[PDB]
Symmetry: D2
Subunit: 237 residues, 4 copies
């Protein structure tokens, strides 16, 4: 039903729905079966940064994930998003835990979108930055198990009062205002997103991952989308 | 009911509710009776620019209105907005026509708000810019007679198919996302707004003006607020 | 001697040094013989906009040139600039006239460069914007025939007191501060440049073009670089 | 000789040249004898943040200094800088140690200046941000004892190989490009600066302080300006 473009930080290989056989970062165009992936060493308990970049000129969606020691994974995919997404969208973050589990903690999130016309100067633009999340975060739409705490963090999936990640959890956070991410007459339609995160588990394996996504304005968690579907897709096709 | 902080571009003197006896720009703190005003030469049919600036350090709300020939009016008012506004707000533009009339055309509007904590780097932030308005402007909430056209403009009050401003009109446009404009622990809470406008009339006098405003999230046009109340206040007190 | 990376707006085909046989936009990596070109309809006497975009993740230098009626040309080239440029650079604009001539007028120019480390937040950054040039432009280094006028424009090549472009002219403008455009540990090193321009001629054909370029800090106009070498290269190899 | 506007973080009271009898933050208009001060609790060994704000509309130079525990000092001064400074300037940071000493370590520094004309959109602008300083910092001019290290910091005054601050030291760092901080036709000329710092001493008292300053482009350390003159002024008048 929904239309999804996503960058996934996938901690758990589900090798029978196309995942490679290692943790990986991927670009998802209307399917959980990534159009392109790269091997990712998730560092348990450390704070990672993800950077996502697209412009309508180069037409290349790119995504790098790094940790402070310097190890990083990158994935790029050539795609014209004018042909995938509706003109108006909501942008958001998603995360899942299923049979295996992890914290899906967001410490900060920023986004910029710009439409530059022909036309001579300038420009429609939207920019937000969160370095601290609050308990009543009025410019965020929280779906499912997602919560904003008193500790300044966004917590996408269930965590218990002792700091333990729960299994079978799904949560999303979407920015409140719709975003105008393309316009047929824009000479440049570009966007960038950045988020920092803390994934930790005392579990045999961490699962399932975190994703930045762009969707139709009325997007909601699809029925049965915990575990490997990352709160983004109603099936694995 | 609503809480209003506003900068008004007041084209029409209503001298029995406190207006000075000339067109004027003013700072409105919870009353249409400006806390401070300056004389303003509105230039019929020309494109003006208004710039509005506040920070929580200097605690001074300032506002300059200029035209291309260089003539400008400025007004400043010392005020601590932490003590006036709720923490979460919506920001918007308002305009009125009553017995006399004018176009209240907005050609562009931009806003930035930032919260900088102690704490060491950075920062919550919100920035939007509109240089072109569209027919279905999904990130704006249009109240009353306000319309976005096919001509890339925001039209706050009624205009007829021949380009004639109608009397007794009220319209507002508010940005879709709530804004976090103060937080007790922010070392700096600042905001800036800019808009461009075209006020024109073949009328004996233009009325009633345009305002940039900040309000509670659930703000709506008060009953009977056309003419001199500028779509902001339910009375003249 | 110098190291050059450039986007050229080439108005004049020199078909024996590799130009295609039409006006074209191109990406120049250490040679006037573009690595990649696209056909460009230069609109005599109209104000064009050029947008140039690169990031170290997608590793794709892209460049679109448009006019208000909407016609635009785009060119993209995959290149890792970490392997071409020195770490510290100056950025600038260049233009030429030779046997044929044109105005090479710049009406505005903006640039942003960012280095984002691993590392967790943020960032080294440089941003400038010129919408008005002044007679004594202290943050620009003017080379050759380039002048800043009283009319708010940057004029790269010779124009006479009657507004006529002179032949055999070369001029460049470089931003005063060196720019740190890559750093081996930056997870993201990106840059964007935008300029607007007015190319006009009553000449049998316009020549020779305008270029945005990045060079070593001590870059200067190479000996004999008028006409087809665009003030960038000491030869045509 | 030089023209100085400064915000000083003054750790050491020199009560016979006008200092109050406590550590203080102050606004300096062409004199070390501050036009306005506020009491400042310098927290030995902690990372402080200073924020400096001015606009040509409100005409109020403001400055807050904070630490992570939340304690902050603020000082504001009404002044029209169009009447104090030359149009073109350099911006910088200064620090001193004399008979008593301290580290004057800068961990980050950012600056934005904007000129908005009448005129309708936009704008000349300059923005830099340093979160990491490098050993060969080509966009900074280092004066006196100031050094940039391998540890990513700017070190304004002498420190010895064991990490001990030396007495009688003076150092400054100025951004490489001149800045156009006012223009008589700008409807808005505004600026903001932010820096973070680490002042530490095992000394009977810390001295002498750190300052952000704006000066003529050709500004240099005045003869005999260590200790209480903070590297800014040739005398105490
Ligand atoms: Ca998976
Ligand atoms: Ca009135
Ligand atoms: Ca050529
Ligand atoms: Ca002192
Ligand atoms: Cl599975
Ligand atoms: Cl399925
Ligand atoms: Cl009345
Ligand atoms: Cl009333
Ligand atoms: Cl030739
Ligand atoms: Cl040659
Ligand atoms: Cl003394
Ligand atoms: Cl003295
Ligand atoms: Mn996957
Ligand atoms: Mn009034
Ligand atoms: Mn060519
Ligand atoms: Mn002092």
């Amino acid at each position: 039903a929904d239309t999804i473009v996503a960058v996934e930080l996938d901690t758990y290989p589900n090798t029978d729905i196309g995942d490679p056989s290692y943790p990986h970062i991927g670009i998802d165009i209307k399917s959980v079966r990534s159009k392109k992936t790269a091997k990712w060493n998730m560092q348990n308990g450390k704070v990672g940064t993800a950077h996502i970049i697209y412009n309508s000129v180069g037409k290349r969606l790119s995504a790098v994930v790094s940790y402070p020691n310097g190890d990083s994974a990158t994935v790029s995919y050539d795609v014209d998003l004018d042909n995938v997404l509706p003109e108006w969208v909501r942008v958001g973050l998603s995360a899942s835990t299923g049979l295996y589990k992890e914290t899906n903690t967001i410490l900060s999130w920023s986004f910029t979108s710009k439409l530059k016309s022909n036309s001579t100067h300038e420009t429609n633009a939207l920019h937000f930055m969160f370095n601290q999340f609050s308990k009543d975060q009025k410019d965020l739409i929280l779906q499912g198990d997602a919560t904003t705490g008193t500790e300044g963090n966004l917590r996408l999936t269930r965590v218990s009062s002792n700091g333990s990640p729960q299994g079978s959890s799904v949560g999303r956070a979407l920015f409140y205002a719709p975003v105008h991410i393309w316009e047929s007459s824009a000479v440049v339609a570009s966007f960038e997103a950045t988020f920092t995160f803390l994934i930790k588990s005392p579990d045999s394996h961490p699962a399932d991952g975190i994703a930045f996504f762009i969707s139709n304005i009325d997007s909601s968690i699809p029925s049965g989308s915990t575990g490997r579907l990352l709160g983004l897709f109603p099936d694995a096709n």
